[PDB]
Every structure is written in C-alpha cells, then in structure tokens.
Symmetry: D2
Subunit: 275 residues, 4 copies
C-alpha cells in the first residue's frame, strides 16, 4: 500500500509544505551543524519525498542519494534535479526507488553512509498489520543498517502522545508543513481493544484558484500513521542499533525535557552508531 | 449495507447466542410480566433476527409478527416456523422483511401493535453517515409509530458508556449471547475528531468441530455499531414519541440507578406511549 | 459466485417470467405425459428458482423436493409454499439449498429420484473457469447421479448455436419467459482466443409503475452463461451417465431435426438412465 | 483508466519489445526517409511509451518532444534521458505527461510540429465508452491539431480486420515487439450485440530467470484495444484533418493493396496536412 499511489498527495505536496525555504529555514542550521560536527559527507535520505531536505543537503555540498517507495513523489524530486541538471552538485545527486522493508537489498550501503535521515513524519506511515511491530523492527533495522559506524541517523515522528491524548492533531503552523493553503486536517484515531492502533489524517489543501472570482477550489487526500508514543519509539529505534548507539531526542529541533511547557509537534530522534 | 448480507454471522448466530433457552430464561419473566401487565396481545418484533424472542412470544400465546432487514437472518426464523408449522400458534406467526428506515411503508401498523420490541443491541447498527442523527431519529420515529397508544416499546442497546470508556467490550457471559463457542470479541473504537463515531466488534465463534481430533475450527465475522451513550438514547427515543410517553430504563432487566455498583452490559429502554 | 446474490433478479423474476400459468401451459402436457409414461412419482428439481415448475409438479400430485443455490430465489418458492401451507400437497413439498457442484453431499439421493429436472436455461450458468469443462462434468455427473435407474433427467439450455452465430439472443416471446414487462435484453459474447467463452445478457424489466403518470420505472440485472453448443452438450450430458442412458432432444418441446425450418430458443435434453 | 497504472506492463515492456535496435532496424529507414523528404525537424511523439522511437529520432538529430499519459512508462524514457544526459542531443529532449483527449491544453502546439507520431498500436487503447466514437474523434482531432500545415502525422494500429476475423492475434515475430521472452498472448474479442466492441490481449512475458535452474518465471499483464477496422480508421483519421490532408497507408511499412498475399500485422497511416 503506497498510500501515495493515487498521486493526489504528491500533486499538492508543494502546496502542503508551503514555502520550502521558510520550512527549511528552521532546523537547517541544526541539521547542517550536526552533520558537519560529525564530519558527514555521504548522506542517504530514505524519506526523499519530493526532495525538500535532499535538495537542501545537495545545495550545501553534501554527497546525497535519496530513496523513496512512492514513484509519484520521487517523480517531482527527479523533475527538480533535471531542471538544475546544469549544476554540478545536482549532476551528482542520486535518486532511486526503495522501501524501508527491503532497503538492505534496495540500496547497497556497502561501507554505509555518514548520515541517514527520515524526516517529516515519514516512518509513522508503516503499519503494524502483522499484529507485532515486526515490520517496524525490520524497517527500523535496515535503516540503521545503512549507518556507517560513528555515523548518524536522524529519524522523527509527530507527537502522538499528544494527538492520542487530545484526539486531535495540532492545527496551523508546523515546522515541516507551513502553508496557508492547508484549510483543514481532520484527525481520526482508531483504537483496537484498548490500544491505539492507527491515526488517520484527512487533509484539505486549497489548490491556488481552482475557480474564477467567487469560486475557490480544494484538493482532499488521506494519510494514515501508526501512533508511536515517544517512549516506545526511543526503545524501538535504539534496539535497531542493538544498543551500539548514542541516543537523544529534541522537541522541535530544540532541547526536550519531559514536562516542559512547550509541546513539540514532532519529536526528532538523533542516534549515533558506535561500531 | 445489510451488514448481514454475507451471511457468515447468520450461519453461526445460533452458536453465538448459545443456549437460547438459557438466554431467554433471563428477562422472560420480566418481558412477559410487563407485556401482560399492560394487556398486550399484538406484538411486533422489528429486530427478529433468527427469531429468538419472537419464537418465545409465539409460544407464550402472543400474536406476533416479526420483521427484519436481513433475509439471511430471517431465513432461519422462517425455517423454524416451518418446522413447527403443525403448531397452531406458529401457523399464525407472521415473518416479513422490513427496514426501520422505511418501516412506516413496510409494515402497515394501521391501528398499531400493543407492544414493539427491538432487543439484542439491534438498533445500534444504524449508522450516522448523514452527519446528523437524522437516520436515527427517522428510524426511531417509525418504530415508535408502530406503538398503539397505551402500547409499549422495548428497545435496548449495549452499555457504550462503558465500552467507550474502557475501549473494550465486556467479555464472557452475556444475557443475550452466552456461548462457550465464542472464543473472542475484539472491540474497535473509531473517534472522528474528538467524538466517538463507531464501535466495530470482530467475533471469533468456534464452529463445533471444524476439524478432526487435534484441529479445531472457527468462524469470523464483524459488526459495527453507533455508540449511543445512555443519556443521548434516552433523549432520542423519548423524542421519537414527541414526549407523549412514559420512559424508564433498566440495567440488565433489573432496576438501574446511575452510580450503582453493578455495571449493566445492556440498557433496556421501556417506553409506554400515551396517545 | 451466486450471480443471484444481489437479489435484483429474484425480486423481479416474476415480472421476467410473466404469466407463469401461460408459460407452464406450454410443455406441461409434455412434461406431465413424459413423467407419467415412465411412472415417475419422486421428482427432484435442481433449478428450483422461484418454484415455477416445482409448484406445477406439486399441484399435479407428484412428490417433489426442490433445491437451488440461491437463497434469494428460493426465498420466494418458500414464500409460496407457506401461503399454500394448508394444502396437503404443499405441506409435503421439500425446499432446500444445494449446489450442483456439491449435490452428492447436499441432497442425499439414496435410492434416487424417478425424475430430475433442470429447466429454464439454468445449467448454462456454470462457468468453465478451470480452463477445462471439469466443473461442467462434475456438476453434470452429480445431477445424473440423482436419477434412479430407469429414471429420467430433463435438462435444457438456450440455443447458443444461434446466439453465437447471430451474436444476438432471440427477442420477445419465449416459452420460459414471456412478459411484456421485459423491455430489453442485450447479448454480450466474449470469445477468448477463437473459442466462445461466455455469453452475458443484460435484462431490462419494467417494474409495474415505478412512477406516477408520465414516469415509468425499470429494473436492470445481468446474467452470464457458458454457451454450450448443442452437439457438445449432448456429448457432455450423455457422458455424465457413463453411456448407460437413452438420449434424445427436442426443439422447444417439439421434435427436433437439424436443419428444420423452425429455430428453437431452447434445447431440451431428455435422458433415461438405463441399467 | 491509465491501463498502465499498475506498472506491470511498463516494468517488462523492455522484455516485450525485445531488441529495440532490431525492432527499430525495421522502418527506421522509411520513417527517417519520410521525415527528411518533407524537411521535418520538430517532431512530437504522443505515444512516447518508454521512448523507443523518440530516442531513435533524438539520436538522428531531430528536435523531439515526447508525451504520454502513463507516468509509469514515461518514467523509463526519463531514466534513459538522464543516463545520456551528457549527450547534447539528449540534453534537449523534452519529455512530459499528456493525454490525447486533452492534448490541445497539455502540449501547446502553437506553431505546431513538422511531424507527429503515434506508433506501436497506441491509439487503439482509446475506448468507445461514450457509445459514439466521440472520444476517438476528439483525440484524433487534437493529435492532428498538432501538425503544422504541410506537416506529417504517422499513426498506426494492429490489423484488427484479421484479428476480428480469426478471433486470434498473430503469433510470434512482430515489427514492433519481437522478443523470445513473450511466451503467450491470448486474444479476447468482445462483441456487444453484433458489433465488435473490444479486443483484450493477455500477455505472458518471461522475466529473465525469475528462478534458479529448473524454475522459470513469468510476468502477466492485460491490455485492451478498440478494434478499429482499416476502412473505418482511414475515414476517422482523415476526418480529423477536416479533409485538408493527403492520406495513405502501408502494410508493415511496405506498400499495401487490399487483397495482397502478405497480411500486415499493423497498418501505418501516413497523413500530410495541407491546410
Ligand atoms: C510525509 S512524506 C515525506 C515528506 C518529506 N520528507 C517532507 O519532509 O516534506 C512520507 C514519505 O514516506 C514514504 N514512505 C512510506 N512508506 C515507505 C516505505 N516503506 N519505504 C520507503 N518510503 C516510504 C512515502 O513514499 C512518502 O513520500
Ligand atoms: C444483533 S442482530 C439481532 C439478533 C437478535 N435480536 C437476537 O437477540 O439474537 C441486529 C439486527 O438488526 C437488524 N437491522 C439492522 N439495521 C436494520 C434496519 N434498518 N431495519 C431493520 N432491521 C435492521 C439486522 O437485520 C440484524 O438482524
Ligand atoms: C434462470 S434461473 C431459473 C428460473 C426458473 N427455472 C424458471 O424457470 O423461472 C437459474 C437458477 O439456477 C440456479 N443455479 C445456478 N448455478 C447453480 C448451482 N451451481 N447449483 C444450484 N443452482 C444453481 C440459480 O440459483 C438460479 O435460480
Ligand atoms: C503500446 S504503448 C506504446 C509503446 C511505444 N510507443 C512503442 O512503440 O513501443 C501505448 C501507449 O499509449 C499511451 N496512451 C494511452 N492512452 C493515452 C492517451 N489518452 N493520451 C496519451 N497517451 C496515451 C500509454 O500510456 C501507452 O504507453
């Protein structure tokens, strides 16, 4: 289930993110700082999407290769690369299809990458269908398996500890998706027995115009995520490295202490493989 | 959406109810008592199902006509009637297809019935698709419209105030469905925005045998209900009589006071129309 | 694939057949004569449908048991039986669900029946999905397996030698379905590679009224048949008896000689199982 | 209905065509000759597919822009362009998504192209759903509307006059698809009433290997075409130019005279707009 196969979400992703520059303005300093601090040059983006963060890293002189399971989303990143094909940096940008579940065979890590990134609440898309989080563990394993020792892994997820609690996803401004075009997002929590099983969001993004004066137009699409509670993900992700890692998490790219006033919309996990 | 069209549920309903006699043993005293107390002879069963309670009322000398929207379920009640066709009582039992939504035209009440019954958590099946409980109000209206003034309406529903609260449906023994054959029931609560929208139960009933020594067999089916909170249903049902009624509700056919120790699995609403 | 599961066809079958009495008027003399001529008293109807011919045989003093795979169609025959439950003849009419494919286990022939009937182009419904006519052979075998030695089997089918040739099904009057209510029947022939694989008919039967003065209403349903060419069926059906049978075929219940002027709409096969 | 959306056909198209060089060897001389003879430099390919003929034209120094409705097929042409991005010719190759039905707005012809090509039996994919060949006429209109006056249009189609007649598509060698990997092609002709409505082909292409020694593997996909009889297409296509055109048709890129011994697998229509 690509969940993006229909292509409606991809078509308007640009409208969903809003000003990519304005979005990337946040955490660019941190991501870049972190990357450089650990002398990272080879970066693998497993959540490429339309290329938002891959493009940023490419421009910033990193050697990036981006993968994604949806060729509908990737098709836009590719489009961008071609458009800037005359730029040496972009001439060396690698964009290929791949799936976390089969990453190991999709992207030959070989020596591995200096850093791996999964941003914008991409991982939560993986379902627990098997009953046990086996799929979660496997995918989380392969992704970590792409990290060269001493390398970095930056994987995030929406704050579901809050969505599950209030039953609603935070509205408006978002560090990853900030666009006045997104008119509505309806949260749908499904709890099997007494455990949260799935959070389904239904977006309503206004396609610029979609009608002459007096008639506005919108695009509607739905995405489903597994609500990973912070504590659980921390445990899950660390386990993916068999413990040989240094773990840490930030609020919205800012330090995070449980009980703090500010409630983050996303939780960024920073893991540094050790051996 | 018959929800019973597939016929899997009907096929094993008998296994789900278990010992009908043992089930009917409960409340038979009360239902009969209540019926007689109000001199009721003409009884309409809008939730006929396989005929459990209609059959009981027939045997008890009442003049009953049973309707139901699922011809898959009704098909078993009919089967029963034929088998006992030699019994005068059963020779006068009426079984026809009908839908609460169109009852008014499906069952010509005319003068009306002395009593109407909807038992076994049948009504909760009606969805709120329209956004507003309009369908609920309409169906609840037609059903009440079949009650002769001074007549009775006995409509029940699972205690969803508890299911919604614990996220799980009560396990094991049940006054309506008590069978050791039912191995599992998985509750699935769906809350759109922050309001409970639907409760989906997934039953696992062991079909006797379904395999030689060493191999047991089961049947799996799913049913979805609108979680009507007590307070809301009391208001809804009373409104269906335009207020010309006498309302009351019992726990599991026993007096019910909010805050009482015993937590009822079902809530039985007893309404007596006045004119 | 019940093909009748949706119930649209059953709901208006009555309208499709038209005047059952006028329909049964044809071949009633022949069927009855044939039956009596071979001293048949126990008759099994494997294509019961709504009960048209079973009812006729019941009224005529035969001891009939009718089976059918569609409970949507059977549900009407049952309805009829109940309505005439006070008639001794109908009190002894047996109606049950069964499938040619599993007839042997569905209907315990035991000694077997004096005659078996499959009329109204019922058998052609069986598809050749398996690639080989295995299903046809098996079903045709079980059906024959219900015939007591010296017994009779009356199985028919539309004249597909003609439908395949003209690509269109004969219009209007029909010995089995004669109703001015049927406004249209669109034939759809599907030939895989160069062999006829399936004939799909789309019926348009006008439901009486379905609208006030000025607005008429119709019902639309589709049925699919395997186009059995005469020669092939003769071979197939005889083989079902392992050759221990006396075969013959009539046009529309009249003698049939290939090349004759009159083009039959149906082909009636009469087989007499022999030692 | 992309008909290619699933992507199974695109994934193995390469295997279906076989040796593109060997395929393109045929008619390359003619296509090129014809193009040059009319001094054509700007070529639009509306059936781009994986880029087979567009690539050939690009290499041959033409200025080509390719469009196609399936992004699953186009995605491969794009892949090819990128790989040869260092070749000036390919740096100027334009590849975009478009649909014959909306071509006029998808590809701004403006002045128009010197030549337009639709090869490999692409057009026959367009269905007649509307009842009337309106869609055929519209699409055929837009495509022609891309031809600059004095320009050329090369549109082909399988010889359905033969497929319809023999009920089977020609086997083996094919000028457009010649690969020993294609193990089977099952034709399926659907005739509504007495008119041929659709021809559905089911391909079985062996994916190289798909299993170790002893186990071979295949890929199965289906495509549906409208069987355009020669005479009809000639009329249809000419009408698309409002008669201001010079029409002609060849067998398999060789002169064609009705009744000739050789039976072409495809019919290539060559139109030269005058207006
Ligand atoms: C929220 S989008 C990413 C948006 C982009 N990263 C951003 O920040 O705007 C999540 C992406 O996850 C990808 N995805 C989901 N499941 C995947 C899997 N199993 N393997 C690889 N990619 C997957 C999808 O194709 C989708 O584009
Ligand atoms: C749980 S079953 C009843 C079982 C039976 N009362 C018993 O106690 O075993 C609920 C019934 O509601 C009926 N039902 C649901 N929607 C209906 C409608 N709109 N009109 C009539 N019956 C309806 C179904 O056909 C189904 O048999
Ligand atoms: C054309 S209808 C019969 C109508 C009826 N004979 C009459 O003359 O009005 C054909 C019947 O064949 C039955 N049928 C089809 N496939 C069957 C199967 N495999 N086993 C038993 N009955 C089957 C259907 O349920 C359907 O009612
Ligand atoms: C047989 S394939 C072409 C293969 C390629 N031209 C060759 O010669 O090998 C037909 C193509 O028609 C395209 N197609 C079908 N309907 C279309 C439409 N309405 N507009 C544009 N392209 C369409 C499909 O996407 C498909 O790739």
């Amino acid at each position: 289930p690509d969940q993006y196969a229909d292509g409606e979400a991809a078509r308007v992703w640009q409208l969903y993110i809003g000003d990519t520059r304005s979005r990337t303005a946040e955490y660019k300093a941190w991501l870049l700082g972190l990357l450089r601090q650990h002398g990272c040059h080879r970066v693998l983006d497993v959540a490429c999407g339309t290329g938002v963060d891959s493009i940023m890293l490419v421009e910033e002189g990193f050697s990036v290769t981006s993968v994604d399971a949806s060729d509908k989303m990737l098709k836009y990143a590719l489009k961008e690369r071609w458009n800037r094909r005359k730029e040496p940096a972009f001439d060396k940008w690698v964009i290929e299809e791949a799936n976390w579940l089969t990453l190991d065979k999709d992207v030959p890590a070989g020596d591995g990458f200096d850093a791996v990134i999964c941003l914008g609440n991409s991982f939560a898309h993986l379902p627990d269908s098997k009953g046990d989080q086996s799929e979660h563990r496997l995918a989380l394993k392969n992704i970590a398996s792409m990290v060269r020792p001493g390398g970095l892994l930056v994987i995030d997820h929406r704050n579901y500890d809050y969505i599950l609690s209030t039953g609603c996803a935070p509205p408006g401004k978002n560090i990853y998706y900030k666009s006045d075009l997104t008119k509505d997002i309806t949260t749908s929590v499904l709890t099997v027995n007494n455990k949260a099983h799935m959070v389904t969001l239904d977006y309503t993004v206004q396609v610029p115009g979609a009608g002459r004066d007096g008639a506005p137009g919108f695009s509607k699409f739905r995405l489903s995520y597994y609500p990973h509670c912070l504590a659980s993900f921390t445990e899950l992700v660390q386990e993916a490295f068999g413990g040989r890692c240094q773990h840490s998490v930030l609020g919205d790219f800012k330090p995070y202490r449980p009980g703090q006033a500010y409630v983050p919309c996303y939780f960024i996990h920073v893991l540094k493989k050790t051996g």
